[PDB]
Design a protein around this ligand. Structure first.
Ligand SMILES: Nc1nc2c(ncn2[C@@H]2O[C@H](COP(=O)(O)CP(=O)(O)OP(=O)(O)O)[C@@H](O)[C@H]2O)c(=O)[nH]1
Ligand SMILES: Nc1nc2c(ncn2[C@@H]2O[C@H](COP(=O)(O)OP(=O)(O)OP(=O)(O)O)[C@@H](O)[C@H]2O)c(=O)[nH]1
Ligand SMILES: Nc1nc2c(ncn2[C@@H]2O[C@H](COP(=O)(O)OP(=O)(O)OP(=O)(O)O)[C@@H](O)[C@H]2O)c(=O)[nH]1
Ligand SMILES: [Mg+2]
Ligand SMILES: [Mg+2]
Ligand SMILES: [Mg+2]
Lengths: 426, 428, 428
């Protein structure tokens, strides 16, 4: 009962999934072959939500892997828990986007999508009652953006009554991978406004910061980042997969943290984050967990949260905790920061508690916030777009796929409007 | 001969209920198996030869909270016909529970209720545990309540509701939920008792000396209170207070039927040795502002009526004295039209204590359910909270999506406002 | 039937009180556990079956001195409801105790007091131990005293205060503290007894033959004196002196209610064998300038009234003779308007002795509480001390910081000055 099939796209998204899946397997106790070796009985009662029980007791991941080139699918098979995945579910093309959303969304992706649109249906049929789809991709390039975007809107025609999650990675100003980020972002966001129910905007610039100072890691890699990001995902859907004193599923969360139709972009956060040095000396108790969580530099979105107010705020705690300890801390925080919470929505807090913790750690906190400080993330992008679009630069790649210069300004306008919605209520 | 049907709605109801059941089991000397190695006839029906099944119905829209009971120690006490389970949850929404999802499950349960209700002969009244702030506990309850007036009507109903706190509350959309669900409560429910978690927490901290409480400590506390209502039925004291009698006593008007509870003494195992528990002291404890179950102010309030229920080692000789003393005091005060305002109950049976319990084993115990103007002020701030939320159409679109028309909100707020003045009118 | 409520304020009060409690326990044959293997009903209430809890309230703004009791031998005698604890200390300041910090703690304690006070039926009067020079013992006491006149008023109060010495004093700002706290003492307190550490020290050295005394030796001494006040209540002698009676006797005017104590005999274990303790000798000992509890001069002073309280082996036949002899002597002298000036009490019960005690086990003992013009001269030098300190605004800024207005000082000094002349007026 209550199943969620997972979708993946892009070079980064796929990688994230690869780690995320592994982590989830570890949490339940699934091995590379698929046979169960775990001891705790409650891992097997909600195994059905993320694993179909196949023949011979070998569980399989309910997933769809998409790409416009075959390069990334090579390393996913050879790595750990690549053998658990079903051969049928891998989808891939021979062309590739080439860091262009125009090629990705119309010409290249629309030929590949019809295979996936048939594959997902089967998955849907398989489970008793599907409650929502998780989606993992990037907005920086053309492959993860153009394909995923194309897909997500066509799901709303067949399944209008289901919740829609999207785990994205938006561009940073300092750590700029590609040149045409402003373009891709500007166009890819447009469709994610009306079609999605919730979106987690992650940024690598913040991740790096988190890594250098807090974890004290001398040589970070993308692997670390993947591990981090996956943790957040694990956190949000913990209440479904395990019992608890106060359970909070996805729909509930959505209802609580999305007050208005067009303002649903969130910012993830994770705690506790401890190095080898801070593992010994940091006293892991609820208050400690709390304070760390609300720090500006501990966020995964590279902004200044204290420029504006949080519209809503929710948290998902794990491991056994006393509720007077838990529920008081939030209140205290609110009291402290009376200038950093919206006044006309009194009592902004939402809490959730799980009995089964992460293996090794005693407690954990996943922070999902909704703020007016997302303006800083978009504003810069808008500016960049303006700078680019003024001289019609890098345009012949997009215009070659049959896109008018008006069609840029149509999405641009929408983006602007969206941005304004935050500054309406700030 | 006498009988009563318990109902449990939402997660909260389920959670509360388990503890209560455990307490009941402890009381009558029944292990989880259901075979005892009379008084218990009310809540337990003896099936064939030595199988005690409870008068119970657990409703929930998730499987998680109900399957917690099916896998635990009390697997043997219930069977799948009693335990009803949905698919899609209420999702902390009134509109999801009442209109969309509520049509399918209620039908299943009504038949079940009938099957349980027609089996027993001496129906005293119903008990319905839920929360106002909860999704299932608001949307389904309202529906359920509406349904129950068709089949029965005059047969009595009670509900022990978890009232939301202004400070320590664990959900954002709670204001809305309360306002809507109180529309059905005024027409249908005969008398609803109200408890606030924040109030409980303070009590847990100060008196019990446990600075790390969780829901399991509150549940236990609640269960004792619940027992103290039904203790008059199941045991034969010198003087008795039935449910109908209680209703007659405590509830004066058609609009007002919202008394609040209190329980004393509640103290640690080490504190029991020093503290000489007298009757007068315990009486006082019920009237203290510190020991109240709701965030309220007895200093501003005036008690119209309040029903004391003693269990353990008590006799009427000093009870009278206690009563007199309270009357004499002017810190406690009543409304002009009610000269005599108490209803006094006694019981020989001592209140039991749970294995590994936070509460100490005591001789005496008290439970006062007071109807008052103190709780009238509690909704004035709720309304304010609600109003602000509504003023800019916050969280409204979700509700609209589930088939809630815009006039519903208008209906529920205005009514609430009207109600707030009623108390004032009565107390002038 | 009879009852009395003890209060302990500040560190000094706590420290004194423990010894007293111990003494009491010794008297009635009660180990620290609180179960005895009647007379004791006054100070101890029997909880349930064999648990004797004291009539007590310890106030302190630090945790250190109160947690000393909680960890020691008498952990079993008290429970955390009786023992109140602050956070920030008085810091040897009157202004910190009364205005800033005093609002929060007093509230907690008043309720507690009520709970204790309403439990007992025969309230004789209150006892309040503190020091004038102490921070908590001045600022809180004044507040507390003020509070207690609202709830009770006519019900009697006593306080055994540690008066500051002109020579041997262990704090710099003591002068200020005394002057302020005496403003509340004149209006509220019915009769306050005064003891000086320096005086005690001399006694300890000369008579007990222990040249290395610490507070524990003084505390014990004090406790005996305290007992000698309350010994008339708890035991049935041939003639009795209740607290009200004492008040009636010793205190003549509204302004003057400051008698001073004295205790005899106090001698070593080896000295008891040689020294034949006669009645006359012990009587004399109370009137000697060497054995007085305050730094004063009986040669300059005149006794208006003084209440003798004998316990042990005494009969009235030689008591009368003793009384006569003193009257006959002219070294001791009285005021013209009082021809008969004694109040004489007797008790059969001998005064007990503590395990490993400095005092010897004796048959007889005496305690004279004398109202006199000798103590009038004691504040003349205090005033001088105070005045100099004030003259250049020394230590004033701290006080100002805590919310003390400048006119307060003016009020307290002038009043004191006025009072000094009253004695003179009376004695002319
Ligand atoms: N957290 C991680 N972020 C990554 C990783 N690899 C890339 N990135 C970030 O994502 C951005 C690039 O995303 P993609 O390579 O998936 C662009 P896309 O696949 O949609 O198009 P093509 O690369 O043309 O196929 C870039 O700004 C990086 O900062 C990774 O392994 N982990
Ligand atoms: N005293 C007490 N209160 C509880 C308990 N569980 C939940 N609550 C309160 O009830 C509210 C949440 O309601 P739930 O019962 O979880 O909601 P629901 O009606 O089951 O709806 P869903 O959660 O969507 O199924 C919160 O405000 C909690 O404070 C409990 O065990 N004891
Ligand atoms: N006889 C006697 N005097 C004491 C004792 N303890 C303190 N004193 C005297 O009391 C004065 C100090 O007062 P404290 O009681 O320490 O002060 P306080 O009122 O507790 O205020 P804080 O110390 O700030 O909490 C000094 O002048 C001491 O001589 C004791 O055990 N016996
Ligand atoms: Mg790629
Ligand atoms: Mg629930
Ligand atoms: Mg001190």
């Amino acid at each position: 009962m209550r199943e969620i099939v997972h979708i993946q796209a892009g070079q980064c998204g796929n990688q994230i999934g690869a780690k995320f899946w592994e982590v989830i397997s570890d949490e339940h106790g699934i091995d590379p072959t698929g046979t169960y070796h775990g001891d705790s009985d409650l891992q097997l009662d909600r195994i059905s939500v993320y694993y179909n029980e196949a023949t011979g007791g070998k569980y399989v991941p309910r997933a769809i892997l998409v790409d416009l080139e075959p390069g990334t699918m090579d390393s996913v098979r050879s790595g750990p828990f690549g053998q658990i995945f079903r051969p049928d579910n891998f989808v891939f093309g021979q062309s590739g986007a080439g860091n262009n959303w125009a090629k990705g969304h119309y010409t290249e992706g629309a030929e590949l999508v019809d295979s996936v649109l048939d594959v997902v249906r089967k998955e849907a049929e398989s489970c008793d009652c599907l409650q929502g789809f998780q989606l993992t991709h990037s907005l920086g390039g053309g492959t993860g953006s153009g394909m995923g975007t194309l897909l997500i809107s066509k799901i709303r025609e067949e399944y209008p009554d289901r919740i829609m999650n999207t785990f994205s990675v938006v561009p940073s100003p300092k750590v700029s991978d590609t040149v045409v980020e402003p373009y891709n972002a500007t166009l890819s966001v447009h469709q994610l406004v009306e079609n999605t129910d919730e979106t987690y905007c992650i940024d690598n610039e913040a991740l790096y910061d988190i890594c250098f100072r807090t974890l004290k890691l001398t040589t970070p890699t993308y692997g670390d980042l993947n591990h981090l990001v996956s943790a957040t995902m694990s956190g949000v859907t913990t209440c479904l997969r395990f019992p608890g004193q106060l359970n909070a599923d996805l729909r509930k969360l959505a209802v609580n943290m999305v007050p208005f139709p067009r303002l649903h972009f969130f910012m993830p956060g994770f705690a506790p984050l401890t190095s080898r040095g801070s593992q010994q000396y940091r006293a892991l108790t609820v208050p400690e967990l709390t304070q760390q969580v609300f720090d500006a530099k501990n966020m995964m979105a590279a902004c200044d949260p204290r420029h504006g107010r949080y519209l809503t705020v929710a948290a998902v705690f794990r491991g056994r905790m006393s509720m007077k300890e838990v529920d008081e801390q939030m209140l205290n925080v609110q009291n402290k920061n009376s200038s950093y919470f919206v006044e006309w929505i009194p009592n902004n807090v939402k809490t959730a508690v799980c009995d089964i913790p992460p293996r090794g750690l005693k407690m954990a906190v996943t922070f999902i916030g909704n703020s007016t400080a997302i303006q800083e993330l978009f504003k810069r992008i808008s500016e960049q777009f303006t700078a680019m679009f003024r001289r019609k630069a890098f345009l012949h790649w997009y215009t070659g796929e049959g896109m008018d210069e008006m069609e840029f300004t149509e999405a641009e306008s929408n983006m602007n409007d969206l941005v304004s919605e935050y500054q309406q209520y700030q | 001969m006498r009988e009563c049907i318990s109902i449990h709605v939402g997660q909260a109801g389920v959670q509360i209920g388990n503890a209560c059941w455990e307490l009941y089991c402890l009381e009558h000397g029944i292990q989880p198996d259901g075979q005892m190695p009379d008084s218990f006839n009310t809540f337990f029906s003896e099936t064939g030869a030595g199988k005690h099944v409870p008068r119970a119905v657990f409703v929930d829209l998730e499987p998680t909270v109900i399957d917690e009971v099916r896998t635990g120690t009390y697997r043997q006490l219930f069977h799948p016909e009693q335990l009803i389970t949905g698919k899609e949850d209420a999702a902390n929404n009134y509109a999801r529970g009442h209109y969309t999802i509520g049509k399918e499950i209620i039908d299943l349960v009504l038949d079940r209720i009938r099957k349980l209700a027609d089996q027993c002969t001496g129906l005293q009244g119903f008990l319905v545990f839920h929360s106002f702030g909860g999704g299932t506990g608001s949307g389904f309850t309202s529906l359920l309540m509406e349904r129950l007036s068709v089949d029965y009507g005059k047969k009595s109903k009670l509900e022990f509701s978890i009232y939301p706190a202004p400070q320590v509350s664990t959900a954002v959309v709670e204001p809305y939920n309360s306002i809507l669900t109180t529309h059905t409560t005024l027409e249908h429910s005969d008398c609803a008792f109200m408890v606030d978690n924040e109030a409980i927490y303070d009590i847990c901290r100060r008196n019990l000396d446990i600075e790390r409480p969780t829901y399991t400590n509150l549940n236990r506390l609640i269960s004792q209170i619940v027992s103290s209502i039904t203790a008059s039925l199941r045991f034969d004291g010198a003087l008795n207070v039935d449910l109908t009698e209680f209703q007659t006593n405590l509830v004066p008007y058609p609009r007002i039927h919202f008394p609040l509870a209190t329980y004393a003494p509640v103290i640690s195992a080490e504190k029991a040795y020093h503290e000489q528990l007298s009757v007068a002291e315990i009486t006082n404890a019920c009237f203290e502002p510190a020991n109240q179950m709701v965030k309220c102010d007895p200093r501003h309030g005036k008690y119209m009526a309040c029903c004391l229920l003693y269990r353990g080692d008590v006799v009427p000789k000093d009870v009278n004295a206690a009563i007199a003393t309270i009357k004499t005091k002017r810190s406690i005060q009543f409304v002009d039209w009610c000269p005599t305002g108490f209803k006094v109950g006694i019981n020989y049976q001592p209140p039991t204590v749970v294995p590994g319990g936070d509460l100490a084993k005591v001789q005496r115990a008290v439970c006062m359910l007071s109807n008052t103007t103190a709780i009238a002020e509690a909704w004035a701030r709720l309304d304010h909270k609600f109003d602000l939320m509504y003023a800019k159409r916050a969280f409204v679109h979700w509700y609209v999506g589930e088939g809630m028309e815009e006039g519903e909100f208008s209906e529920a707020r205005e009514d609430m406002a009207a109600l707030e003045k009623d108390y004032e009118e009565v107390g002038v």
